[PDB]
Design a binder for this molecule. Structure first.
Ligand SMILES: Cc1cc(Nc2cc(-c3ccc(F)c(NC(=O)c4cc5c(s4)CCCC5)c3F)n[nH]c2=O)nn1C
Length: 264
């Protein structure tokens, strides 16, 4: 879906990410959208447009909805569903004292449902983390920017020893061999659950990225946050098996989460 740029009205700046400036605006005067304006040289653009069709076809309530792209001018635009409460990490930190435990579990469920959908389509996120989830005006969490890490042109982000690589969300086989799979998204999801239940703390705080890699390679795992029950911690901890094939699927994780809800 090629969006006509004449149908976009820019309204507000939303900050800057791995591809440069992001704006809030409207599509056809009515629908609230976010618009990434892709900084030249920041993205493998031919590669992105080449593979853009499969992303058009991903649709789930808990996935941020793609509206489309503008590719007939530079900078390229990516147009998505606007999420008025912004990214999940800042939302957790700003509302930290208000959350009930049942709401923390519901946020995890939202993300798990989106990821079970992506898993069913054999589509990898590759940078799942609370910073890449968004929150709407009703508090629903949705997964954002799935698959886009593949198109980043920035050695600090693409190298496992780069300053911007998501080391703290990565399993050993990604840090050692760059072996991304559904099971590396599973690992990241466990870290995301930890971010939720810690109310937005930084994983492995005071460890450097390389110290993090060393310690998880040797079996260290994130501690149980105060607000996580044992049953909840067992779920997130299952995401962190050293061996990828021992980690659950998102279907199983979703069933575990629903089971905890039912018990509650
Ligand atoms: C109050 C409020 C609402 C609101 N709502 C939104 C903000 C954004 C948004 C803004 C800046 C960003 F930097 C990003 N992330 C990125 O650009 C990238 C992430 C990744 C990229 S690029 C390539 C590698 C993989 C990860 C955003 F997603 N989008 N959509 C929204 O709805 N924001 N605020 C402040």
């Amino acid at each position: 879906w090629e969006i006509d740029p004449k149908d976009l009205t820019f309204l507000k700046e939303l900050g800057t990410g791995q591809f440069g400036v992001v704006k809030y605006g409207k599509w056809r005067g009515q629908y609230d959208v976010a618009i990434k304006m892709i900084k030249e040289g920041s993205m493998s653009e031919d590669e992105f447009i080449e593979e853009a069709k499969v992303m058009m076809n991903l649709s789930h309530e808990k996935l941020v909805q793609l509206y489309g792209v503008c590719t007939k001018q530079r900078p390229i635009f990516i147009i998505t569903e606007y999420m008025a409460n912004g990214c999940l990490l800042n939302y957790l930190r700003e509302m930290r004292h208000r959350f009930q435990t049942q709401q923390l579990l519901e946020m995890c469920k939202d993300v798990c449902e989106a990821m079970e959908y992506l898993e069913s389509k054999q589509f990898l996120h590759r940078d799942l983390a609370a910073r890449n989830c968004l929150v709407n005006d009703q508090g629903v969490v949705k997964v954002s920017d799935f698959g886009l890490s593949r198109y980043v042109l920035d050695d600090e982000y693409t190298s496992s020893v780069g300053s911007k690589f998501p080391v703290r969300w990565s399993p050993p086989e990604v840090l050692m061999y760059s072996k991304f799979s559904s099971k590396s998204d599973i690992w990241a999801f466990g870290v995301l659950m930890w971010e939720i239940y810690s109310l937005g703390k930084m994983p492995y705080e005071r460890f450097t990225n390389s110290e993090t890699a060393e310690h998880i390679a040797q079996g260290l795992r994130l501690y149980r946050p105060h607000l996580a029950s044992e049953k909840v911690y067992t779920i997130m901890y299952s995401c962190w098996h050293e061996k990828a094939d021992e980690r659950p699927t998102f279907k199983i994780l979703l069933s575990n989460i629903l089971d905890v809800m039912d018990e509650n």
